[PDB]
Amino acid sequence: GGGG
Amino acid sequence: TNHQYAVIAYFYGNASLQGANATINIWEPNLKNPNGDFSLTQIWISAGSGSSLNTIEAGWQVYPGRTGDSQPRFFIYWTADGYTSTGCYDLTCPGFVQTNNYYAIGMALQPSVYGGQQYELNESIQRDPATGNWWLYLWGTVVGYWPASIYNSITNGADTVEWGGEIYDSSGTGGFHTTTQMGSGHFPTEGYGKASYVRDLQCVDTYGNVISPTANSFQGIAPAPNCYNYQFQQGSSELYLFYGGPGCQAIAHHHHH
Ligand SMILES: *[C@@H]1O[C@H](CO)[C@@H](O[C@@H]2O[C@H](CO)[C@@H](O[C@@H]3O[C@H](CO)[C@@H](O)[C@H](O)[C@@H]3O)[C@H](O)[C@H]2NC(C)=O)[C@H](O)[C@H]1NC(C)=O
Ligand SMILES: *[C@@H]1O[C@H](CO)[C@@H](O)[C@H](O)[C@H]1NC(C)=O
Ligand code: NI
Numbered sequence: 001g002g003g004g
Numbered sequence: 005t006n007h008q009y010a011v012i013a014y015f016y017g018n019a020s021l022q023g024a025n026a027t028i029n030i031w032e033p034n035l036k037n038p039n040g041d042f043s044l045t046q047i048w049i050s051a052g053s054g055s056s057l058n059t060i061e062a063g064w065q066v067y068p069g070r071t072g073d074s075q076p077r078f079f080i081y082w083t084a085d086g087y088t089s090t091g092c093y094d095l096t097c098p099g100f101v102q103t104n105n106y107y108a109i110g111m112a113l114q115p116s117v118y119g120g121q122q123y124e125l126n127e128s129i130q131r132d133p134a135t136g137n138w139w140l141y142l143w144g145t146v147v148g149y150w151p152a153s154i155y156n157s158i159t160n161g162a163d164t165v166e167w168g169g170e171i172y173d174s175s176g177t178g179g180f181h182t183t184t185q186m187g188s189g190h191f192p193t194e195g196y197g198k199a200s201y202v203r204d205l206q207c208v209d210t211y212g213n214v215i216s217p218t219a220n221s222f223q224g225i226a227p228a229p230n231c232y233n234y235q236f237q238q239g240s241s242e243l244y245l246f247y248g249g250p251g252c253q254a255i256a257h258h259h260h261h
Contacts, residue, residue, distance in 0.1 A: 001013045001164040002050035002059045004225040 008179030010186060010234040010247035011168030012205075012222040019051040019163040020210035023130040023138075026063070026167055027204035030123045032076050032115035033066055033171075033185035036251070040174025041184050042067035044079070045200060045247070048166040049129055049138070052157030057086035060138050060150050060158065062127050064113055067172075075112040078125065080140070084155050100140075102148035109147070118188065119197050126204065131161060161210065167202045168225075168234065169247045180228050180252060187248020192235035195246065201237075202245040219243055228252065 026047040035041040046063025061081035070093065071077050082099055083091030092099060094109045102109060116122040128141040136152030136159040152159040169186040173179040187200025206216050219236040226233045232249035 001015065001166050002048035002057065002061075003046070003166045003168075003170065004009055004011050004013060 006173045006176060006179055008171050008173065008186070008228045008232055009168060009225050010232045010249065011166050011170070011225045012234065012245055013164060013166040013225065014207060014217050014222055016163050019158065020161040021049075021163065021165060021207050022133070022161055022210065022212060023128070023208035024049050024162070024165045025126075025128045025204040025206045026202055028063060028125045028127070028202050029187070029200040030064055030076055030113045030115055030125055031188040031200050032074065033187065033189050033248075034183075035066060035068070035074065036182050036184045037173070037175045038068045038074065040069055040172070041182075042069070042172045043169070043184055043186055045169045045187060045202065046167075047127065047129070049162045050158065050164045050166075051162045053086070055086050055088055056157050057083065058155045058158035059083050059091075060129060060162070062129065062140060064125055071110065076115055078107070078109065078111050078113060078142070080109060082150055082154070090154070099154050100148060100150055104146045104148065106145055107142050107147055116188070118190070122197060130208065136160065165207055167205060167245060169200070169232065171232070171251070177254070180231060181254040181256070183251045183253060185248065185250055186232040189248065189250050191249050192233055192246035195237065199246045200248045202247065203242055205243050205245060216242065
């Protein structure tokens with residue numbers, strides 16, 4: 001996704 | 005990388021989510037290496053992947069290298085190309101449009117007290133279907149929007165929403181042996197008043213209805229679980245994401261035998  | 009996380013992700017089958025909320029417990033985590041470290045808790049709303057990843061970001065961060073002090077401060081971020089050549093914090097580049105200056109982008113927040121008074125950052129992000137612009141509200145008050153004109157993948161809705169904590173370890177331990185704190189600096193098992201939480205874990209579906217996903221609908225990410233971790237606590241009204249930790253002390257001592 002976006003933040004991981 | 006030198007980033008560590010305690011985050012949950014909600015993956016939708018297509019890019020039709022029309023918004024999301026996050027109510028984030030505020031703390032002032034300590035940094036072991038303030039020259040370059042940071043610690044934050046945020047939401048990430050995204051569409052696409054790789055160089056077509058678009059994000060909408062908002063939360064609190066302790067980042068002395070950027071803000072000039074160790075207080076938790078409200079921040080925003082975005083990217084339209086997977087952080088390759090676009091995007092920035094706050095209003096340092098053209099992108100976000102602030103419409104109401106009642107709340108300042110970058111404002112200091114009041115940190116919660118361990119075992120005492122708690123403070124929360126309520127943020128609500130909502131796509132306007134007439135334009136594709138994504139509007140930001142703090143504690144119900146409008147701030148501004150990320151316009152559709154800066155994006156290519158998230159103009160019609162988002163496919164993913166993530167919530168939680170992140171630290172940046174400038175000392176080069178991979179975030180595995182730094183006492184830079186995440187959340188309150190205490191493990192999620194300590195619970196309300198001691199460990200940090202994210203609540204109001206809600207998204208807006210294609211039709212405009214608010215959905216609160218059940219605990220099983222999220223995928224968890226905690227790559228340094230002895231340092232920072234997460235735990236869902238289901239209340240009788242809403243689901244909590246407890247997250248964070250004290251980080252790991254550098255107490256390894258291996259030698260060949
Ligand atoms: C969680 O996210 C939901 C969905 O975005 C938020 O709900 C939205 O909240 C606003 C403010 O209460 C509502 O706006 C109002 O709309 C009415 C018309 O229905 C208008 O007369 C008012 O002046 C105002 O603009 C909006 O309808 C509502 N949307 C939905 C789908 O329920 C909610 O605020 C978020 N919760 C938190 C705590 O962040
Ligand atoms: C996305 O998926 C939902 C649920 O499967 C569906 O209702 C919707 O029509 C799809 N497409 C768009 C553009 O929202
Ligand atoms: Ni060995």
